[PDB]
Symmetry: C3
């Protein structure tokens, strides 16, 4: 009562959160934040990326000109979205290395088509069919020109088209495989058939194959689709003695941030940077567990479903410096205006006051970590395919291995980051507590002794103004030293 | 002698181990554990994975039905093991994209075969040869049907088989390349030859090639092998005007954890989760240096041959807090019952006692690290090939680049992990020493002074019970304070 | 004046450097070092790697024997350098899977050619042309043998060459595609044409294709190039009924550290381990931002343009322990002979002296980090291509994805490394300051008090020798204790 008590302490909360550290699988901190995005809003937002809903059409079909896809002529996109309900409703076709054509078009991001006046003298043009109905009338692929005999003849062709432009030209064309020699003759006069299209730096030579294939919408014949790119100064040369499905011009081909994604998520009227096939996801967090397939500024895909980053000190209700959860027995739930503070007992009563500077010092360091982690995601656009409908073997093994390797390495980085950061956050908060204790100890000089539990026995009368002077660093120890020394060193 | 001495200290061992840290390439700790598995027991354990020793046969040969491999019919496996002594002893064949077929079968993990009744009217069946001897009699691939002319004719074929099942069908078939036009005629009547097998979504068209190839076991002709997968609702259509080696049915194809590995390690009767081509390896450690090729729950392959994780404090025989290898000059080899402790000298003699709580605190943190690192390996099954017998160029460059990239990134993670963990382990053990010293200092209050080497000069008579009271935290400093103050502050 | 003052402190500089840490985006340290190499000297040094400047020739052209490339016969290289000004000046040719052939030759690293005596009876040899002029005379590819009819006939060929050597043989050959049936007849008698070259383990069957292609230097015909590798015990068998461009022997094929790089950097007379297409770069730093394409012992490519590693303490002009930028208000710019030191004031004046041991302790730890980071780069030779002139789709997507994945993971490692190291460097330097303060405090025992700003009020007369005794650890506190106690505990 000719003394006072001044206790240093830290807050605590009733609702702590369990986090992982380097040394401990489960340690409770006052607060934490989730680093793995685990949910989607279920819609693909139409902003800020130019979305193109394929709806009933695949990219290839819109490219070829299946009547169902006429509304897609000359469209551009940042992301083309293919629905699984999609289906082709024209002449049956295949594409050798389909995936590569789909990819290069997707990545180009435009269906811009220019018509070119090819010299088809000696042949019938605009071939038409019952399996490809447009406006209730028999039609064909809008971008392709089906050549047939004219007056029962079909001469050799040797037509050229030069690229005298400042850009690349993308040609799409194909070969017809009739189901019967009857049809071969009926359509092309001759029995055989041969197609050869060349440039200065390439040649693709195709030999038709008459034969039966299982009928698709009642058609047993097939078209095989091919592409060739012609650069400025180069020339397209197309030779044919049969079966040639002719281009009507070229597609502009670009390089940019365009791509394509398989999804059945509906398009919504909203704005979100990151798109997955499950829908758009917020990109505030650095990691996500929604889908390895993403487009835009996205958190990185990891295996974990949750990773909590501590944003507060260890919670001790009721560190390397040994203050928090050490010589200070527990935290103060009644301290809600700061993280660290003072409790005192003197002649005028018992009080509690937060220390702002130590509180702010810890908060700033924690916000420093958050600043490095939150809202810093990176943009990816066209990548590789990561889900597959058919067995292909080698190349598919490689593609899957690459993505699995990547994911394990990112999942490792995420796990280690959080464990290291959390160990460090618990240590820095213990350190700020220790610094406050140490600073106060030095202030008191010979006027007080450390009771070993964060409390100082102050060996002189110390009213509220006196305690206040200690808390704001204006305590003059010389004023009380004589009083304190006599109380300390007596019998 | 009207005083006592109490010294704080830590153990040390005669046999220290050198580890790496962030700041030091070679620092000695009391104990460490090896994180890189560097040895195999030389055998592939037959448990707990279903092992299939190919012995004399490659997977493809067991698939085709080389008489040598009859015992393999309809077998399943988790891991198929190909021996290098393996060799084919039937009709000479090649497979275009051999590696992809080998892969998809390996990954499927079953040789389950169902026979199908194909309508081969107009042809001779069960063709047979001298290069493929079964039961001492001329035979052929058990799963293939060699068609030849019947009565010197060989009509067009147009046979269908539909998939009306709930699963995929895998068809294996092939084309015969006779060495002479003589043989072409002798076998198939006609001079030419043509094979076309189709589904609703595919077509593979093959044209035979008569010609001589260097004789393998005296045969200059060859079979080329092909495969096609037919899904539910789809149909196989096979057209042929020559040279068709016919399937006798389909293989069930599955998806699972199956794979294949090249090794000459004998199969042992033992249980081990992780298999390498050198033999099975323990998977307690997180890393391994045995082989980049693995199967099962395996440590990750890294380049280092050794990485030691400190599991004890710095060894100081004869840190950031400056206690261990700092103001405490050395450790105590005579302390074998704890890591940290007390030595005293008083009127009753000199003694040493371990402090359990500080010892346990360091041990728990170290076990926390071990828990994150030991026995936590991850399962990989079918991957990519990582050793190659032939030059292939581009794709092989990519496969090698991917694995080399992966390995360097894991080797980096391993190196950094151990350096960080070791720096931290040395620091946390120094910290526990410091906390014990600090706690003891506070206990003694004004009754003792810090001599600067971890020892306290206690300024009062302190018998064994008194020293004991300090060690178990029951020391009442008020009892001795008058005695201590008078001894401290005299002349 | 019956007292002295002894202040503990650390240096500071006028020219600090901003670095990143875990908790702070911008913190000033006394010194830092750059970890990202951002510049090239613009030349490719001809040492210590054997450089081969392709100059006007591509690797393939030197391989085939384009007259322009005669000087390259049988050359070896560590790194072949292709110039963009390069051009072919012989018979127009293409290579299917050009990139794979270029790669395997590059990786082999030799143009060693042995001539082989093939039995070409029944044919004319040494075919020659106007598009391939050597010594002012019509010539051909030096390594190829253009076969034509002899006396208007051209029999079937069935020539063998066996590998009875201890090494692999690499055969290069090709097929001629005449522009007219006229030329086909003129050159090869027959109308058709067929080439089939085989080994015991392979067969490549080619069918020529008569037709027009856009003329390259006035030639509309083309040669297609192929390769086959024959191992010891195996045999080359080449059948042909037309159009065969024959090999004149084989290339030795090796395995080693050879590769190829596209660059327009001039070759310089200098020595540098690391080569990029921009020129050689120093490899002292662990990372580089110059080019993802490298050869030799190179720093790793990362995205950042700069990463500064702190090599000094926090700069405080005018940490977890709270000494530097904590209870010590600022550093001393006037201390240029050490990092930590003593300032005193006594009867004889005011002085400053560096403490070497604490200075050396921090410097050693920092050099420990530098030793792990500086001059430890790793050797890579032949890798994958990373820049592309044509759209290819799938495989190119995979190659680009792999490199982009790798780069992001290394850029992550670099960013985290520096942030962790810097946080730790700032903390260890604060720790050394704290240890020095703590050690000094203990030395002084009851003779001094901590004023709270790193300074001790020493309560006795302490001349220069006395202060000196404190700095070199020979201070005997017992000598002054009576004097000090009386001054401390008075009124
Ligand atoms: C080969 O066989 C298939 C199936 O038996 C034939 O295709 C069928 O043709 C009939 C008309 O005769 C159609 O009604 C069926 O719908 C077809 N089935 C399928 C699965 O496409 C085919 O015509 C035969 N080939 C030849 C040349 O006759
Ligand atoms: C092409 O040449 C090869 C090798 O000279 C011939 O193959 C040989 O045929 C004889 C029989 O006449 C066998 O005894 C040899 O063992 C064969 N050698 C090899 C390497 O296979 C082949 O017959 C020739 N082609 C033709 C059509 O006669
Ligand atoms: C196919 O057309 C091309 C271009 O019209 C022809 O190639 C030209 O041939 C003339 C000679 O008649 C040359 O002067 C031109 O330089 C050639 N142009 C190109 C682009 O190569 C080609 O001859 C035609 N095919 C046939 C069989 O006549
Ligand atoms: C290009 C062309 O004119 N094709 C005609 C075809 C062909 O005769 C068959 O595809 C060959 O059997 O027959 C019809 C049809 O199928 O709709 C009308 C169409 O005009
Ligand atoms: C399918 C078939 O019946 N093949 C017969 C062959 C062929 O005549 C040759 O392969 C062509 O020269 O000759 C024999 C043989 O080689 O064992 C017996 C066998 O019956
Ligand atoms: C192998 C050979 O002898 N080729 C001859 C060719 C061919 O007649 C044409 O390439 C076919 O039109 O014509 C010439 C030439 O072009 O230089 C001379 C040369 O001797
Ligand atoms: C703890 O409770 C408070 C008050 O209800 C709340 O604001 C805070 O978010 C809670 N913390 C956690 C981690 O849920
Ligand atoms: C928990 O931490 C996060 C991140 O700093 C913050 O947004 C949230 O407000 C905190 N919760 C409380 C109750 O302070
Ligand atoms: C898509 O096709 C379905 C039939 O499969 C049809 O009902 C629907 O109206 C089509 N949608 C559009 C936009 O054409
Ligand atoms: C074919 O149809 C297109 C438009 O559908 C037309 O521009 C073109 O002139 C037609 N060709 C012929 C030969 O009539
Ligand atoms: C393929 O089979 C059908 C039925 O005979 C028919 O297209 C034809 O006969 C066969 N192909 C050839 C090239 O003869
Ligand atoms: C996203 O879709 C995948 C299937 O493509 C599914 O496995 C995953 O659970 C989905 N995620 C969410 C959050 O719905
Ligand atoms: C320090 O506390 C005393 C006591 O209440 C007060 O009078 C004084 O204004 C404070 N000083 C500062 C700088 O706030
Ligand atoms: C040190 O020696 C003891 C006793 O022989 C032994 O148990 C221990 O394993 C040794 N430590 C090392 C790292 O070898
Ligand atoms: C060394 O550490 C390992 C891991 O904690 C432990 O298994 C072993 O018993 C330790 N050795 C000694 C001698 O304590
Ligand atoms: C495997 O083949 C060798 C001959 O190459 C033979 O000696 C051995 O008995 C065969 N093993 C089996 C299991 O058939
Ligand atoms: C061919 O042999 C199999 C069994 O080896 C038999 O089931 C089949 O009936 C035979 N075919 C003919 C046409 O005899
Ligand atoms: C290939 O060479 C041999 C020997 O003459 C024979 O098979 C045939 O004559 C050649 N091929 C063709 C298609 O003529
Ligand atoms: C495992 O096999 C590889 C060769 O495939 C060899 O380089 C390596 O040394 C072997 N490891 C052991 C531990 O035997
Ligand atoms: C503390 O030590 C004293 C002295 O030996 C002993 O009597 C007492 O039982 C100890 N207290 C505890 C709680 O063990
Ligand atoms: C600071 O200045 C000194 C003297 O000019 C110089 O040697 C040193 O390199 C400078 N530090 C930096 C980081 O530029
Ligand atoms: C800065 O640090 C680097 C690396 O230790 C060193 O080379 C350089 O001399 C230092 N600069 C000064 C001025 O000490
Ligand atoms: C390379 O070709 C150019 C013409 O394109 C020529 O001027 C130059 O002399 C050539 N250089 C060599 C080394 O042949
Ligand atoms: C073809 O030319 C080469 C050298 O240019 C010569 O060795 C060879 O004998 C010639 N061939 C003939 C058939 O003259
Ligand atoms: C290709 O076109 C040109 C011009 O007629 C010529 O080479 C030939 O007629 C065509 N090809 C065939 C195989 O007829
Ligand atoms: C190196 O070359 C690349 C283009 O290949 C260029 O983007 C980069 O800026 C160059 N780097 C330097 C340091 O010149
Ligand atoms: C310590 O300092 C004193 C005072 O100058 C000096 O006489 C003595 O030689 C020093 N001791 C050592 C070991 O350098």
């Amino acid at each position: 009562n000719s003394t006072a008590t001044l206790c240093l302490g830290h807050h605590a909360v009733p609702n702590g959160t369990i986090v992982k550290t380097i040394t401990n699988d489960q340690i409770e901190v006052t607060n934490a934040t989730e680093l793995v995005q685990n949910s989607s809003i279920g819609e693909i937002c139409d902003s800020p990326h130019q979305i193109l809903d394929g709806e009933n059409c695949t990219l290839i079909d819109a490219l070829l000109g299946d009547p169902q896809c006429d509304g897609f002529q000359n469209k551009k996109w940042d992301l083309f979205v293919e629905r699984s309900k999609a289906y082709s409703n024209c002449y049956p076709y295949d594409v050798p290395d389909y995936a590569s054509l789909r990819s290069l078009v997707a990545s180009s991001g435009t269906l811009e088509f220019n018509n070119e006046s090819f010299n088809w003298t000696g042949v019938t043009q605009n071939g038409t069919s019952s399996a490809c109905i447009r406006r209730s009338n028999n039609s064909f692929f809008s971008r392709l020109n089906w050549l047939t005999h004219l007056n029962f003849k079909y001469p050799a062709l040797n037509v050229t088209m030069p690229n005298n432009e400042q850009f690349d030209k993308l040609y799409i064309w194909g070969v017809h495989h009739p189901g019967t020699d009857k049809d071969q003759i009926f359509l092309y006069a001759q029995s055989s058939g041969r197609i050869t299209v060349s440039t200065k730096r390439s040649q693709q030579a195709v030999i038709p194959n008459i034969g039966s294939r299982p009928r698709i919408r009642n058609i047993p014949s097939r078209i095989s689709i091919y592409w060739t790119i012609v650069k400025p100064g180069d020339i397209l040369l197309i030779n044919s003695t049969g079966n040639l499905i002719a281009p009507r011009g070229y597609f502009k081909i670009r390089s940019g941030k365009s791509s394509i994604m398989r999804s059945d998520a509906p398009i919504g009227k909203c704005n979100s940077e990151c798109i997955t096939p499950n829908g758009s996801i917020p990109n505030d967090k650095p990691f996500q567990n929604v889908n390895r397939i993403t487009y835009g500024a996205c958190p990185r895909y990891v295996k974990q479903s949750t990773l909590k980053l501590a944003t507060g000190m260890r919670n001790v209700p009721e560190g390397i410096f040994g203050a928090i959860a050490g010589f200070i027995e527990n935290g103060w739930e009644g301290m809600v205006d700061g993280w660290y503070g003072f409790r005192h007992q003197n002649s005028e009563g018992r009080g509690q006051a937060a220390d702002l500077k130590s509180t702010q010092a810890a908060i700033d360091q924690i916000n420093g970590k958050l600043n490095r982690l939150i809202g810093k995601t990176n943009e990816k656009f066209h990548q590789i395919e990561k889900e597959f409908s058919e067995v292909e073997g080698r190349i598919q093994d490689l593609e899957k291995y690459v993505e699995d390797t990547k994911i394990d390495l990112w999942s490792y980085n995420a796990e280690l980051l959080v464990a290291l950061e959390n160990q460090h956050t618990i240590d820095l908060t213990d350190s700020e507590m220790n610094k406050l204790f140490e600073k106060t100890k030095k202030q008191l000089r010979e006027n007080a002794e450390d009771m070993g539990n964060g409390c100082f026995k102050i060996y002189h009368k110390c009213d509220n103004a006196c305690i206040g002077s200690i808390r704001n660093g204006t305590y003059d120890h010389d004023v009380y030293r004589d009083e304190a020394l006599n109380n300390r060193f007596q019998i």
